[PDB]
Amino acid sequence: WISPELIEILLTILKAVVILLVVVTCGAFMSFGERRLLGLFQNRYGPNRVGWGGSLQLVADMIKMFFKEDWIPKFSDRVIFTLAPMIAFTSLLLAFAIVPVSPGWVVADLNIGILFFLMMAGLAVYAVLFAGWSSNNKYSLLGAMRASAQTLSYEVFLGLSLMGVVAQAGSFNMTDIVNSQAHVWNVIPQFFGFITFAIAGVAVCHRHPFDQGYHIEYSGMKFGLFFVGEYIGIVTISALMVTLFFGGWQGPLLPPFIWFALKTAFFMMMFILIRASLPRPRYDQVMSFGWKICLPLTLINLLVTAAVILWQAQ
Amino acid sequence: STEVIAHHWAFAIFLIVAIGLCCLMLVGGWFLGGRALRLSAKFYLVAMFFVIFDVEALYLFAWSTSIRESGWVGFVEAAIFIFVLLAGLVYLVRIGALDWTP
Amino acid sequence: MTITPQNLIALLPLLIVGLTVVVVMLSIAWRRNHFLNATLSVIGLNAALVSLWFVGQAGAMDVTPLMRVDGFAMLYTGLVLLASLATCTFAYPWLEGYNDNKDEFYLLVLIAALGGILLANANHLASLFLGIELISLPLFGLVGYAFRQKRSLEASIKYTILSAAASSFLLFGMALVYAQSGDLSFVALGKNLGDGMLNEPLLLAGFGLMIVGLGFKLSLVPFHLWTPDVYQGAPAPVSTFLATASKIAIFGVVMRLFLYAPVGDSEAIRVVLAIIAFASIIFGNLMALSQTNIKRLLGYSSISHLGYLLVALIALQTGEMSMEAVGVYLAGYLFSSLGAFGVVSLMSSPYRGPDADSLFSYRGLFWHRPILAAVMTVMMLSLAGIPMTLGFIGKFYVLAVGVQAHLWWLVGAVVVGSAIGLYYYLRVAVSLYLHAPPSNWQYSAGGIVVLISALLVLVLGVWPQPLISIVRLAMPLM
Amino acid sequence: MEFAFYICGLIAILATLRVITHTNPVHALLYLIISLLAISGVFFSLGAYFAGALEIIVYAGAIMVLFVFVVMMLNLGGSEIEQERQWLKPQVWIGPAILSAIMLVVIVYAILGVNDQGIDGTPISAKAVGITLFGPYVLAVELASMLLLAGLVVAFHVGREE
Amino acid sequence: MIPLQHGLILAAILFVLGLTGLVIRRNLLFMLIGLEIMINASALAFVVAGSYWGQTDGQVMYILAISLAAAEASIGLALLLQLHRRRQNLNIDSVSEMRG
Amino acid sequence: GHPNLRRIMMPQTWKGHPLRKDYPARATEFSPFELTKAKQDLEMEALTFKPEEWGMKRGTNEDFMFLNLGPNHPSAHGAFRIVLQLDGEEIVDCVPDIGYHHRGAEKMGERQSWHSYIPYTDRIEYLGGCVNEMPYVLAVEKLAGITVPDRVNVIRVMLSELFRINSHLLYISTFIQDVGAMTPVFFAFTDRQKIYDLVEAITGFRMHPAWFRIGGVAHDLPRGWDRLLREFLDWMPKRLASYEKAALQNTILKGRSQGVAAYGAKEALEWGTTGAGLRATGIDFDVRKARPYSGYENF
């Protein structure tokens, strides 16, 4: 069984498995780091006793949530109730699945790329919809209608925000996107695309300030699945933002993984800072900002990007 | 090529391991531990606007990957497309279709 | 193939009506004004109608890998634009009594007119499909415009469900045709077959599925059951538009498709279309014998007249005046349906609420409305094939076309259906004069439109030579 | 390549068959979404990558979301639907199923008599689709935008609450 | 190496299944669902036909097909919401006011 | 002539009237049967809700829905219910369901001595403390004919103003948190900890000092109170400006708060509204100036 083809296949499989394991542990440790960073922002310490520096708090949470009594409501649909955390985890996980972390270190070098990210987000809205329906509660139903309306109102321009980087790269591939950032990172030309993608990625992750309850009927491992899927999705959006607007793994001196991890961790810290600082806007202004402002901004940005590209092509 | 079939195997392993990992943690959560309003039409309007603008967005998705090959003629065609889309959006905004509170 | 300035000036009615749609939408978004929006709509449609003359100056050519502009496109674009202008003119007094928003009606009429112009200019399967749906969806809006009324909502639901099913059938048929052929151009549907294997099973089945879809769209038997209910439930200007513009545009694109496709010469398709036309004439004439409602009777009339049109369609590959006969018949049928449904709309205007009935009560119309009764009986005699009417000239053209191609079964069907149509049309025209027990210039404009249609039918029935010369001048590309 | 096509086609057929014979609207829409995912897998196995991408982005990401939105808006608890079982009585479904089966055999006989060298499965990228879309199909794009606008206007006019 | 006939057979099977669901179901919602299945099957047939010939025409016609499908689904759901608002039921056989 | 004279403090299925002299003040024996049946009415209250019981009319037209916020709110203002008549998201009728926090403080006042009732006066407004103790001991001193010396007046004014600053800081923090910004409540609770340090030094307790007495205060001021007061007075204004610039000048908070539930002088006068609302209606009425007490004229 000694052959270079089988060795390469096993090595690529191990690389994908390593990427997935690092992502799930990074999401869980980022929930712990969200707690710690909220403590740091709010002039306190946070969890720092369970193990060295609180690093074993996540293990305690996992053990508690595994050994808690699993509950499914008596008057609820079992399949949909079980299937909502499945979507909330796996949809944005496989949205991460296209992100290139290093040259030669990728899971799938697809020809669609952030198109596949859009498929995964459109699948991810079903988690909120299914959790609202399967709870058999009208309060959670109305909350899910509101949350799904918000996520639709911002997914309506998520892809059009990514279209500026698509136009400047000329292809849907992520490797071509990070190769086109060899001189100037995409945050400089596609700045409006950058802010609109930031707002859209914040909104579709059900995070501050675009949130709300449909979580009340879940408990035990299903609530933990929703939680870790939310943080894994924040990791996914941060890494996609790094690979789309900040060159990804490209850097002058450090190894490419060091630059990619530094930019990703900076965007996670910026997520926690956004949660700590900004207040909650009301529904009407949130939907008005999603529709009236960001979508025409993305359309005008795409038009200006096309005009600049065709002007620069002699 | 060896690289492409290796990449397909890696993607298949990623999908299978992710789905099976979430299923396994669901099974473990189920296994461990002992035991003891009328909705308005504004949601429909918002979802329908999302659907229509998502199809116009898919047209723009198709255009954006081939801007250089289409030339200035494709830019003109997409300009009329985006102008019609923005006229529709302005029409929706000005009649109160996108306003939640009356 | 790219677009030239010559291709742009050949695109003038499409661009003008689209710019009218954008301008009307921006006017609605600025301030809801019924009069201003209707004026902008009719000015845009008239601008397209007069830019047809510049299109005729530009000549006949192929504008797209999709569209082709020639005299065929000129004639059918003019018919569709005239139908849309008459629809707006009849729609304003009906919309004067509407409590809800009125400006969306003209937007939908403009978009449906755009779809009709695209169907007139269509030289592609994609363009044919897009024109069919661009006609259908505004008709979904207009049929159920008065959705509070039960009849209009029911007609909208029936039309939407059945047209979605027929669009699925038509798209599956185009998919089978494209799988057989490999090119979606009209001329290339059968160019890859020779030496007597034109009757390929996949191509025949695909063309049969689009025949099903178009026979729904043309109220052909046995896809005709929607016609009286949708005609009755919809508003009367919507009934006018659905009777004239949609049928004219779809039959024009069917004419162009069957003329340009080499598989239209195949005998099995011609025999199937002969059976469809025979059954359509017989059924649409027999089913209107005992109708007390003018809208259902006019729907069965539309079924029978489209059967006569299909009879003229069958001899397209044999005769030489078959498309000329179709043009003359379609002009006469446009004017006949315009006059009849305009009289119906002027009696049904303004909209007197959704809870009140829209009953016609045509008995004794002469004793309070003499001019409208005269117009209505003129159009009733025109639809019967009675002489000194344009409908008689169209019926004579259909009869000559059927005589040329030895389609004697279809000719006997035309004679029998003409007798039955004579019975019910004369019953309506004589019920107008029995005994039974406005105030704005838009209503006067609608009355002027129906009076001009009646006078045009009378003059071109007495003297049909200018219309024949105009239709012969609309020569398509061989 | 062909393995994925056959498995996804069988999954889509089974899911649609469970769609048309189900009483729960949400379960029917879930099986419909599963069939859409399988049909997009069929698309990806045939090289039409843009077709599958738009199948899950739009067909399984906008249209089915709208259907689930409407279903949960109505709060359909199967009133006079779950308690009827009308489509499962053989006197109702034997006729239409026989008719659809007859049409299926006719279409299959038509399909089996065409030239077929097979599908090579070469991936047609979205770049070529966008080149053809804004090249030889400009009027298709503009009038499709017009059609989407018309559908939006009609659905706004009909689905208002007042 | 996949035959075109097998893809066309799959599309035909899905089309007649959607039509059967459109016919035998008295609910308007399941009728719209069956309509969605039929138009998706037609789009699948167009994609298979386009990929057999190696052309982008199939994908372009699919794009037009799903634009129509999205618009038609929106229209039918608006009409369904109007029917459920003004009649409190989705019985398609009970809405038969005009006939003959 | 009352539109709806139902019980507001006790539940509707309560026998007798508690503030009558023949009613026993002390707690009756507990029964799980009463609790279980009351759980049954708590279960069927959503199903058997009749708007005519609560004074609402034309309930369920069928364009109105009934919303119950309580009984437990996720806030520090207490636990209570509000039933709302709704058209979509618009409130047309609403009545609050109160009495979930009834402690019988008046009935307790009839069974405690004049001296032993002061800790009960603490827990009337539990963010007030000495502010709640002051009117009771002032009225008892009016009964006793006691004129307190000046040092007593200034000490009571000091503690009342300290607890007023504590309550105002907690109120501003909870309003900011209810808007959506959860950060400044931590810093303002640190400021409340500074106030609590001074109050612990003076009275020996944090929240309910029970330190005011009939005729004075329980102890003299501890040696070193002025140091803690000086550090607190130096600490406060920078933190106040920081909270202002962080949240009360934010445009999102202004959009959430400006123009919401506005009333004029007539509405405040006819409904007995006092304090911040009455002065926000333009009426200058503070008891510390109009009818001065505890030597407030010397400040």
Ligand SMILES: CCCCCCCCCCCCCCCCCC(=O)OC[C@H](COP(=O)(O)OCCN)OC(=O)CCCCCCCCCCCCCCCCC
């Ligand atoms: C709870 C579970 C529910 C069901 C979940 C899914 C079940 C199936 C799991 C096993 C899948 C096995 C692997 C399938 C093949 C993966 C590789 C692949 O698709 O390769 C084809 C193509 C390659 O692209 P490229 O390299 O660019 O090609 C150039 C030259 N070939 O690449 C592509 O075409 C890429 C695009 C297709 C990728 C599909 C990914 C999965 C989509 C479904 C997600 C479902 C999410 C959960 C449920 C949502 C609610 C229903």
Ligand SMILES: CCCCCCCCCCCCCCCCCC(=O)OC[C@H](COP(=O)(O)OCCN)OC(=O)CCCCCCCCCCCCCCCCC
């Ligand atoms: C195993 C028994 C059944 C077990 C339960 C069901 C599990 C899911 C089964 C369906 C999905 C997986 C099917 C198997 C895919 C395996 C990978 C494969 O066949 O790849 C081939 C090809 C790779 O790309 P290509 O460049 O064409 O490669 C040619 C090789 N030179 O691939 C392609 O070109 C595209 C590959 C397909 C598209 C991506 C994956 C789509 C997945 C859709 C899932 C739908 C929901 C299924 C739900 C099942 C449970 C209800």
Ligand SMILES: CCCCCCCCCCCCCCCCCC(=O)OC[C@H](COP(=O)(O)OCCN)OC(=O)CCCCCCCCCCCCCCCCC
């Ligand atoms: C990897 C992806 C994530 C990347 C992380 C880093 C970026 C995070 C981006 C977060 C974006 C949050 C956007 C919040 C939008 C809120 C819009 C809204 O509803 O505003 C309402 C408010 C009042 O509006 P009005 O209708 O006038 O109400 C007055 C009525 N009396 O209106 C106003 O007060 C006016 C201002 C509205 C908001 C403008 C945008 C502010 C965005 C937040 C600040 C970002 C600063 C830069 C952060 C670092 C970026 C690198």
Ligand SMILES: CCCCCCCCCCCCCCCCCCCC
């Ligand atoms: C938030 C970061 C998530 C990363 C997910 C993927 C992890 C893959 C690990 C790859 C390790 C080797 C990287 C290439 C070698 C060069 C760099 C070596 C030092 C890190």
Ligand SMILES: CCCCCCCCCCCCCCCCCCCC
């Ligand atoms: C043959 C083509 C049509 C020619 C014109 C037909 C008649 C049109 C209407 C003219 C006006 C008719 C007035 C009839 C009055 C009858 C009064 C009867 C009194 C007992």
